[PDB]
Design a protein around this ligand. Structure first.
Ligand SMILES: Cc1cc2nc3c(=O)[nH]c(=O)nc-3n(C[C@H](O)[C@H](O)[C@H](O)COP(=O)(O)O)c2cc1C
Ligand SMILES: O=C(Nc1c(F)c(F)c(-c2ccccc2)c(F)c1F)c1nsnc1O
Ligand SMILES: O=C(O)c1cc(=O)[nH]c(=O)[nH]1
Ligand SMILES: [Cl-]
Ligand SMILES: [Cl-]
Ligand SMILES: [Cl-]
Ligand SMILES: [Cl-]
Ligand SMILES: [Cl-]
Length: 352
C-alpha cells in the first residue's frame, strides 16, 4: 500500500532522525493510546490455542506497552492479541538513560531498560478500568496477555512472580513468566506459579507460559522441555532478545550492553522454536517472536512450530502499517503453499 511505503520511506526515517529511540517510543505509546493511527482478517488467520480464539496470529510483543497504557489502540492497529509488561511487583525506574540504541544498518535495536515498571498496583487499576471491555474483546477473538517480571532488589524471585499471578492473573487471558530478560530451581519456581494460578477462580484463571532466551545451552533447552511437560505448563514464548552479537553487525552502537532484537535475531529465534517444538513433541503451544517483519518471517516460525507470532522491533522501523503488511503477506503465502489456514501450517516443517 501507499501508507506502508510512506511510513517506511519518509515518515519513520524522518521521526528517527529527529528523536532518540526512547523519546520516539514514548511518542508512539502516546499516539497509540489515543487511537491516532493510519486489512480485514479472514477465517484463514484464526487460531484456537491456550483456551482462546485469536482472530489473527500476529501479536505485539512484551516491552512496547510495559504499563498497560495502549491496549485498545494496539487492537486498533490490527494485532490479534496484545501482551503488556513486563510488570514488576513494586514500581521501579530501570536503568539510567540512554538505555536503548538503534542499529539502522542492521534493522536491529539494543536495549537495556532494566524492567522500568509502574508496578502491579498501578497496572491492576489501569486494567480494571477496562475489564469488561477486555472481556468482550477476548470473546471476540482479541485476547490479552500479561508478562510478569521481578524487582531488581528482590531476594525471593518466585514470590515476586507469585505476587504477579495473584494481582494480574484475574485480569489476563494468559500470564508470562519471563525468566529471560538480558532445572530444580525452575521446577521450584514454576510449581509455585502454577499453584497460585490454580487458586484463582475459574472465570479468572489464565493460561501460564514461560518465555525463554535465544542464548540457552542444549542442556538448558532439554531441561526446560522436561520441566514444562512434567508440570503441565500451558505454553512457551520463544524468544526474548539475545546477549550474543552475531558476526556482521554494522551499527556503530553494536557493542552497547543489552538485548539485541530485529533482523539479526530472527533465525536464532526460529531455530529455538524448532528445537523446543521437537523437544515437547508438538504438545506445548509456542508463541514465536524475534525478527518478524514480513509474512515470510511469520510463516517460517509457524512452520517451525509456532501457533502464534509477535513482533516489536519491526514496528519501530516501519511503523503501524507493518502489521497489516505482515498479515496480508502471511495470508498470500499460506494460499501459495496450499495451506487451508494458519492452523494447518503449525509445525509443518517437522512433517516433511
Ligand atoms: C525496547 C524493548 C523492550 C523490551 N522489554 C521487554 C519486557 O519488558 N519483557 C519481555 O518479556 N520482553 C521484552 N522485550 C523483548 C520483546 O518482547 C521480544 O521478545 C524481542 O524484542 C524479539 O522480538 P522483535 O525482534 O520483534 O523485537 C523488549 C524488547 C525491546 C526491543
Ligand atoms: O517506537 C518507536 N518509533 C515509533 C514512532 F516514533 C512512531 F511515531 C510510531 C507511530 C506513528 C504513528 C502512530 C502511532 C505510532 C511508532 F509506531 C513507532 F514505533 C521507536 N522505538 S525505538 N526507535 C523508535 O523509533
Ligand atoms: O530491559 C528490559 O526491560 C528488557 C529488555 C529485553 O530485551 N527483554 C526483557 O525481557 N526486558
Ligand atoms: Cl530499577
Ligand atoms: Cl540511537
Ligand atoms: Cl499478593
Ligand atoms: Cl478480578
Ligand atoms: Cl550485553
Amino acid at each position: 500500500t501507499g501508507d506502508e511505503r510512506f511510513y517506511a520511506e519518509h515518515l519513520m526515517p524522518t521521526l528517527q532522525g529527529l528523536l532518540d529511540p526512547e523519546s520516539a517510543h514514548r511518542l508512539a505509546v502516546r499516539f497509540t493510546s489515543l487511537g491516532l493511527l493510519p486489512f480485514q482478517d479472514s477465517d484463514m488467520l484464526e487460531v484456537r490455542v491456550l483456551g482462546h480464539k485469536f482472530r489473527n496470529p500476529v501479536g505485539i510483543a512484551a516491552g512496547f506497552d510495559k504499563h498497560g497504557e495502549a491496549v485498545d489502540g494496539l487492537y486498533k492497529m490490527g494485532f490479534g492479541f496484545v501482551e503488556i509488561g513486563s510488570v514488576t511487583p513494586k514500581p521501579q525506574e530501570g536503568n539510567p538513560r540512554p538505555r536503548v540504541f538503534r542499529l539502522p544498518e542492521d534493522q536491529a535495536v539494543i536495549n537495556r531498560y532494566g524492567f522500568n515498571s509502574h508496578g502491579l498496583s498501578v497496572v491492576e487499576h489501569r486494567l480494571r478500568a477496562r475489564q469488561q471491555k477486555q472481556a468482550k474483546l477476548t470473546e471476540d477473538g482479541l485476547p490479552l496477555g500479561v508478562n510478569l517480571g521481578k524487582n531488581k532488589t528482590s531476594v525471593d524471585a518466585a514470590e515476586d512472580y507469585a505476587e504477579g499471578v495473584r494481582v494480574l492473573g484475574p485480569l489476563a487471558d494468559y500470564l508470562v513468566v519471563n525468566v529471560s530478560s538480558p532445572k530444580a530451581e525452575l521446577r521450584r519456581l514454576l510449581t509455585k506459579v502454577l499453584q497460585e494460578r490454580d487458586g484463582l477462580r475459574r472465570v479468572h484463571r489464565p493460561a501460564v507460559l514461560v518465555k525463554i532466551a535465544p542464548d540457552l545451552t542444549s542442556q538448558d533447552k532439554e531441561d526446560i522441555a522436561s520441566v514444562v511437560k512434567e508440570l503441565g505448563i500451558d505454553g512457551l514464548i520463544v524468544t526474548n532478545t539475545t546477549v550474543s552479537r552475531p558476526a556482521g553487525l554494522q551499527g556503530a552502537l553494536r557493542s552497547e550492553t543489552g538485548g539485541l532484537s530485529g533482523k539479526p535475531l530472527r533465525d536464532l529465534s526460529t531455530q529455538t522454536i524448532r528445537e523446543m517444538y521437537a523437544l515437547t513433541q508438538g504438545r506445548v503451544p509456542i508463541i514465536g517472536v524475534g525478527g518478524v517483519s514480513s509474512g515470510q518471517d511469520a510463516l517460517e516460525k509457524i512452520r517451525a512450530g509456532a501457533s502464534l507470532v509477535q513482533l516489536y522491533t519491526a514496528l519501530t522501523f516501519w511503523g503501524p502499517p507493518v502489521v497489516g503488511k505482515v498479515k496480508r503477506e502471511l495470508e498470500a503465502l499460506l494460499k501459495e503453499q496450499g495451506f487451508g489456514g494458519v492452523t494447518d501450517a503449525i509445525g509443518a516443517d517437522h512433517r516433511r
